Amino acid sequence: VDFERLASIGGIKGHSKLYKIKGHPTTKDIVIKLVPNLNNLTVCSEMSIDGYLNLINAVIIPISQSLELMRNNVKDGTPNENIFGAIVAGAALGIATAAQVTSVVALHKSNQNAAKINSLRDSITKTNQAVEQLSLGVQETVSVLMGLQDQINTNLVPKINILSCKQLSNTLNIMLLQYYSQILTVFGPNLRDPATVPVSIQALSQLFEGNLELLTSSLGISSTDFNDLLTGKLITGSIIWADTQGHYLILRVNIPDLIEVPGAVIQEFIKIGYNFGGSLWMPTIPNKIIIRGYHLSLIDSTNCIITDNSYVCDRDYSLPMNPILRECFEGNTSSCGREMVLNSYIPLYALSEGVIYANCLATSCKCATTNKPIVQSTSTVITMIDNSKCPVVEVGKQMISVGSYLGQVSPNNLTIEIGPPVYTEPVDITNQLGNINETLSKTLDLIKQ
Amino acid sequence: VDFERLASIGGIKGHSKLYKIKGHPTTKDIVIKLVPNLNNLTVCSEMSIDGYLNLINAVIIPISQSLELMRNNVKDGTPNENIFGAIVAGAALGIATAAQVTSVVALHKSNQNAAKINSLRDSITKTNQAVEQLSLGVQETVSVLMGLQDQINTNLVPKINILSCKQLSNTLNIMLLQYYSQILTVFGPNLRDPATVPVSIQALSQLFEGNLELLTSSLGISSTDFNDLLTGKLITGSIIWADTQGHYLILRVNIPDLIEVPGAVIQEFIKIGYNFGGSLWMPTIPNKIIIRGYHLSLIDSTNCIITDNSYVCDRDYSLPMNPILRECFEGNTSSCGREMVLNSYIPLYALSEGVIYANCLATSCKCATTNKPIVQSTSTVITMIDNSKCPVVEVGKQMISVGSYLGQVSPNNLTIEIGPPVYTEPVDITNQLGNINETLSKTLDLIKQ
Amino acid sequence: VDFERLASIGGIKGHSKLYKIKGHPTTKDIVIKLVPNLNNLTVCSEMSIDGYLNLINAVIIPISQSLELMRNNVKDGTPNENIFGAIVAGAALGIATAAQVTSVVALHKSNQNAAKINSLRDSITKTNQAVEQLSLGVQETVSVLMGLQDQINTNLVPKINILSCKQLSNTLNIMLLQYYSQILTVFGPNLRDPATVPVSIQALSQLFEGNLELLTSSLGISSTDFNDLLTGKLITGSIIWADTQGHYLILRVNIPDLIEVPGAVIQEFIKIGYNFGGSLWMPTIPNKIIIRGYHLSLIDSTNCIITDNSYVCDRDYSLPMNPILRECFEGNTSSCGREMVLNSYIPLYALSEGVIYANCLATSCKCATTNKPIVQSTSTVITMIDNSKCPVVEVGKQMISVGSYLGQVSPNNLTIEIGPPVYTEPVDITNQLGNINETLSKTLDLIKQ
Ligand SMILES: *[C@@H]1O[C@H](CO[C@@H]2O[C@@H](C)[C@@H](O)[C@@H](O)[C@@H]2O)[C@@H](O[C@@H]2O[C@H](CO)[C@@H](O[C@@H]3O[C@H](CO)[C@@H](O)[C@H](O)[C@@H]3O)[C@H](O)[C@H]2NC(C)=O)[C@H](O)[C@H]1NC(C)=O
Ligand SMILES: *[C@@H]1O[C@H](CO[C@@H]2O[C@@H](C)[C@@H](O)[C@@H](O)[C@@H]2O)[C@@H](O[C@@H]2O[C@H](CO)[C@@H](O[C@@H]3O[C@H](CO)[C@@H](O)[C@H](O)[C@@H]3O)[C@H](O)[C@H]2NC(C)=O)[C@H](O)[C@H]1NC(C)=O
Ligand SMILES: *[C@@H]1O[C@H](CO[C@@H]2O[C@@H](C)[C@@H](O)[C@@H](O)[C@@H]2O)[C@@H](O[C@@H]2O[C@H](CO)[C@@H](O[C@@H]3O[C@H](CO)[C@@H](O)[C@H](O)[C@@H]3O)[C@H](O)[C@H]2NC(C)=O)[C@H](O)[C@H]1NC(C)=O
Ligand SMILES: *[C@@H]1O[C@H](CO)[C@@H](O)[C@H](O)[C@H]1NC(C)=O
Ligand SMILES: *[C@@H]1O[C@H](CO)[C@@H](O)[C@H](O)[C@H]1NC(C)=O
Ligand SMILES: *[C@@H]1O[C@H](CO)[C@@H](O)[C@H](O)[C@H]1NC(C)=O
Ligand SMILES: *[C@@H]1O[C@H](CO)[C@@H](O)[C@H](O)[C@H]1NC(C)=O
Ligand SMILES: *[C@@H]1O[C@H](CO)[C@@H](O)[C@H](O)[C@H]1NC(C)=O
Ligand SMILES: *[C@@H]1O[C@H](CO)[C@@H](O)[C@H](O)[C@H]1NC(C)=O
Ligand SMILES: *[C@@H]1O[C@H](CO)[C@@H](O)[C@H](O)[C@H]1NC(C)=O
Ligand SMILES: *[C@@H]1O[C@H](CO)[C@@H](O)[C@H](O)[C@H]1NC(C)=O
Ligand SMILES: *[C@@H]1O[C@H](CO)[C@@H](O)[C@H](O)[C@H]1NC(C)=O
Ligand SMILES: *[C@@H]1O[C@H](CO)[C@@H](O)[C@H](O)[C@H]1NC(C)=O
Ligand SMILES: *[C@@H]1O[C@H](CO)[C@@H](O)[C@H](O)[C@H]1NC(C)=O
Ligand SMILES: *[C@H]1O[C@H](CO)[C@@H](O)[C@H](O)[C@H]1NC(C)=O
């Protein structure tokens, strides 16, 4: 890429940041209970828990049935001693994809640990606090949790005798209906196929009043640097057991790790408007260019957080680009398109290493040190301001200082090769393909002559 | 649609679902009280209600004057000779659509029931609980409802003498300001034209801590199956009255239904990457094809929820394709477009009726029962794998089992034909336009002579 | 623009509203403290504040360091003959934009007032109420506030001795993790550079349970008409100080004003389907047209709220419109394009000042004064209906009355030109990609002839 020619056409080189992709995740098993274990409220709680039980058993049972169905198709013990592993009975599958097979293999791998955690069902159902830990093994422990367990251990407990029992039953019914609305909201897409659908950690967090940090801390991840504090919205987890007896859900989550792709640097750009042909124009370039070993491609940070120093993505998002755009970035400013604007929010000046790139035709350019106006050149449109002209500069309204030097090439004396203009592209451009069509079927009429 | 040549072009036939959408327009009517009724707080409440009342008086009166204007835009009379009424006022609508006329007919249809509900205004204001059902007639009822009644019947009521009265007044002001912010949030677009704008049941439930099925069970809808349980976001409804003295809003909602359009089957597809020209490609076909008696249309599930077995839409969303797409799906794989990718997240193999469609040029394909590689034929690009080759297949890393049979013919032994790709960013269409600019007078240079 | 031919192609003139732009905002300074001042809880608080402080220091300290680092890059003083201008040291900026320069100038303006507010740090940290005021000067005041100060002044305070101190400590821990997650949620993009990123009042109010007009009333701005009730989602604020001692942020917010651009009228339109060629077609014209002294342009309401009488935007969003669309709106219905629709939710009739535009080919049309049907003319598709034919009209299933007159000339008796249909696919481009290439040999063939 040539920054001098692309600055001649009106694009200024922005920051350079890194690219990091999530990769190599380890697994951790969590358990979530659903039944609010009340021990203090055995005086006045009545039958009303069983209505909540009937409403949650409408969704606990079919998820568990599909979960035991999907783990039933796979088997182990490949024929021959040389070949061994998990075998998917694809005749019993019907239609399946690669990630579904991978999830089936993962569930078959975690079936033994699911049975190991299922051995502690009475330990799961005996908890009376919000979040606590129980000894899974000699070195492993579980992370049982309920957000609403605290709500009938710090709010509804002290009103055990001041307030009437039917009012406690009605308030518990309102809270249970609201919580069942929350579980109904979060396990929406999970109802179709609860094996191949990951669970967002924030969607888990709205079950517990939107506290993602409690799940992050009790899960074990402790973000310390600046880069991992923004990260935490990409933690994925899958359900491995859906037990109906204690009415609990055993899930397996993936602890992320931000690996770094070698040699890939994300380069940003700033687009300014320039006055050509009596109109204001902007070059048509993408904002972000990934560069890796003299190779230009495209990415999208639609799902990626952007730090001050790097681009952090959940997964690699490499998109191809047109070779005409590659020639536009490399040498050919004639191959770069331009669009027109007339709105008031167009930047005309910007700073780059102490060098001002400014359109002086619309912006007032002056030097404070000499008190003389600066005129637009006719060989260029974008006008540079450095310490060669004047140190202390009047641009627009503002006093500024400049610094450094162009380095290699001055685009003031360089020729101008602004390419063809493009228009706006709504469904209007399909109507211009329509009048291109009538021009072409005029030429088809002129073919026969 | 032929699935063998569509498997040759790179598409795999996915699941088949239904289009059981829309239903009978049975309705129901409820009452939304705004001012909460305090009865235990007659000791220490001051006149903190007056600021809330002055805040809501700026809201309630415009909807009331708009609705009485809208009733002034219609009469019935008995003009003509066969017509016994239901005429609209001439030119009093100004600018109006068909849905506005339908809303006019709806208010003229329900004004008698609105007067019937308004006959018990003193019965409306005497409620001191959250949700009540009061008898409209002999076998009829409505639902008067106040979700913040509980918060000043279980939280602010017991602190009547423990906490100081000015602190209760301040906290009451805080929750009144918060709840008035909630009404200002939910009746945002409703303030412009409060007769033709429906009300989302989820945004209505957001006034009540997001307890949707509390409103649903108080309404009367009891979804019992899997398909209708996810449904409940298609309730909707329109306000029929905005009474100022009781400060309440009489709402009319529609009880939905799920009828089935006959013969319409939604078909899913899986698009895999194939290695042609030393490059990775995918075919360009839409994901869902609706088929009804040899008729292909297009749909968009931008709002429709997807069940495990069918598609639930609020309303029919039929779209067409080009006839070139119809020939692409029927017989012409040369008319099916393609796209080039280089990203890592491209699946290359999938399963369909125990038959593997695999890109073995990039995927390791072996038979574990015989320990031999599976090689790509030069005639095919996508490899069919069944039990005729080998029962246990190594694909990728995984042991899998195949089964069933082929189905008519195979896609491997068929001829393959392909076409050019194209993308967005119409600067290439701009160069094509300049090509037309030079081309049309490239024609009229040396035709004759 | 005409409305006779434009309704003859099927577009009906909607309401005419105004255009207003937010302009000239003044500045007011607020302060936001973050450490919850507990005074009643000195009996049982333990050291749970220390973990919250350790969590929030990693956010507070680098924001303050970046703020003072950006503060160092601007200097004042006289550049020889010029008096002042706040000279920006451009060597200490790297790459900067115009908005960043304006923000640096804003903080250079606000350093003195930030120091004046920072002189009352012990006054800031001593507040034990939710929202209260302190005297900044003889005529200026500050607006120190918390949404969660009340929560440990009305909820956790009365359970000082009834509930155990470790349960109070755990409840405070859970609520502090939840609120620390709230600050991590709202200050997401602010951590990259906390000077150039504006702060929305909505996400700020999300820290205080979504009570927007509590913040608005503490600011002092008050809405009084219909147009300012919907306005309230566009308040812009910027960080001016990030003090780590009392752990508070001094913020400067911009109280706005809705200025009116003169002569600009936003025109809406209603597009109906018309039956041509045995099929339903939809004309392709934009819904909104801004007209200002015979000047058509394009706008987008992607962020602008729409009131009953005007358009309220955060900033001007004028876009150029095509000269082919200028011929479409002025004279040439051939330039007005079309598309082919088949879905059932297409309106075919509408009312405009007692003028019925009705496609009577698909809609039943009658006059029950005479009890006869109304037929379709061959010279037009859209049916003109006024009181000259019959004053009381039957359209579809609805019985209406009309008035007024035609409007200059009737839109039924003329003949209008037509545009071609379009689609939403790049297939056409690929067609031409080889088409013009094939027709190129044909052009030379004409030359050969
Ligand atoms: C999940 O897998 C289990 C285990 O069965 C094994 O896997 C199947 C896929 C087949 O390949 C089996 O041959 C294989 O053993 C299946 O559970 C089994 O279900 C059957 C009924 O389908 C049960 O038989 C019943 O048993 C008693 C006998 O007294 C009577 O009630 C009935 O007469 C009937 O025969 C059987 O006990 C049960 N268990 C075992 C170990 O075979 C299961 O069908 C399968 N699928 C699902 C969806 O759960
Ligand atoms: C909505 O409609 C009511 C009812 O009036 C009926 O509908 C109107 C659209 C017109 O077609 C009327 O002719 C028709 O009766 C309107 O309320 C009426 O408003 C008028 C004033 O516009 C009232 O007249 C006043 O009455 C007393 C007489 O002592 C004095 O205060 C005034 O001198 C004045 O004459 C009238 O009483 C009232 N009611 C009726 C039954 O006619 C209403 O104006 C209309 N529009 C709106 C915007 O509310
Ligand atoms: C922000 O600015 C302050 C003020 O410094 C002034 O502005 C800077 C932008 C430069 O132009 C300075 O020349 C100018 O004075 C900076 O504080 C200063 O930091 C320096 C170190 O960077 C301190 O020097 C130290 O001082 C003592 C001397 O006994 C010893 O510890 C060291 O040997 C060392 O020399 C200096 O005292 C201090 N104050 C002043 C008034 O200069 C500050 O660093 C700067 N930037 C940031 C990121 O905070
Ligand atoms: C409440 O429950 C706790 C925990 O089980 C127990 O220690 C306490 O004694 C109970 N109190 C009453 C009054 O039941
Ligand atoms: C593009 O640039 C190359 C050198 O980088 C040059 O040879 C070529 O002619 C240019 N093409 C244009 C300006 O169209
Ligand atoms: C640009 O070229 C001019 C002559 O046109 C020359 O005076 C000037 O020094 C050049 N600038 C450079 C090489 O930076
Ligand atoms: C293109 O033009 C031809 C000839 O006028 C017309 O028949 C055809 O429908 C048009 N096609 C498209 C896709 O615009
Ligand atoms: C509180 O209100 C309820 C319901 O109206 C009533 O039964 C009760 O007596 C009231 N209590 C007091 C102390 O006013
Ligand atoms: C595929 O075609 C080949 C010849 O090209 C033939 O030998 C083979 O039997 C065919 N397989 C089918 C029809 O399944
Ligand atoms: C290209 O330009 C104009 C429109 O700008 C068009 O009318 C003309 O036919 C085209 N060709 C030439 C040779 O100008
Ligand atoms: C609680 O704090 C308030 C306000 O500072 C004070 O008036 C009151 O005495 C305190 N009460 C106790 C029990 O400490
Ligand atoms: C466009 O309209 C003008 C008058 O406004 C007319 O002279 C001209 O012929 C029209 N052009 C068409 C229909 O192509
Ligand atoms: C429409 O044209 C007819 C002649 O075809 C004429 O009689 C009639 O008055 C016209 N209507 C107008 C101009 O409104
Ligand atoms: C059409 O011709 C142009 C110019 O030679 C070429 O760039 C383009 O690839 C061709 N398109 C096809 C599909 O052959
Ligand atoms: C497919 O069949 C159609 C006729 O139905 C034909 O026009 C097309 O060329 C065929 N596909 C080929 C040979 O590319």
- Tell me the span between the first and last alpha carbons of chain A: 48 Å
Return the structural class of chain A: alpha+beta
The greatest interface here is: A-C, 73 and 71 residues
Which shape of chain A, going by the Cα principal axes?
elongated
Q: How many β-strands of chain A, per DSSP?
A: 26
Taking the sheet with the most strands of chain A, its summary is: 6 strands, mixed
Strand order of the largest sheet of chain A: 15-14-11-1-17-16
Helix segment tally of chain A: 11
Beta-strand portion of chain A reads 25-35%
**What value does the Rg of chain A take, in angstroms?**
32 Å
The percent range for helix content of chain A is 25-40%
Bound molecules: a molecule of 4 linked components (NAG-NAG-BMA-FUC), 2-acetamido-2-deoxy-beta-D-glucopyranose
Oligomer: part of a larger assembly
PDB class: viral protein
Keywords: Henipavirus, AngV-F protein, Pre-fusion F protein, Cryo-EM structure, Fusion Ectodomain, Dimer-of-trimer, viral protein
Entry title: AngV-F Pre-fusion Protein
Chains A, B, C: Fusion protein
Question: How would you describe this structure in keywords?
Answer:
11 helices, viral protein, 26 strands, AngV-F protein, binds a molecule of 4 linked components (NAG-NAG-BMA-FUC), elongated, alpha+beta, four-stranded antiparallel sheet, six-stranded mixed sheet, Henipavirus, binds 2-acetamido-2-deoxy-beta-D-glucopyranose, part of a larger assembly, 3 chains, 449 residues, 25% strand
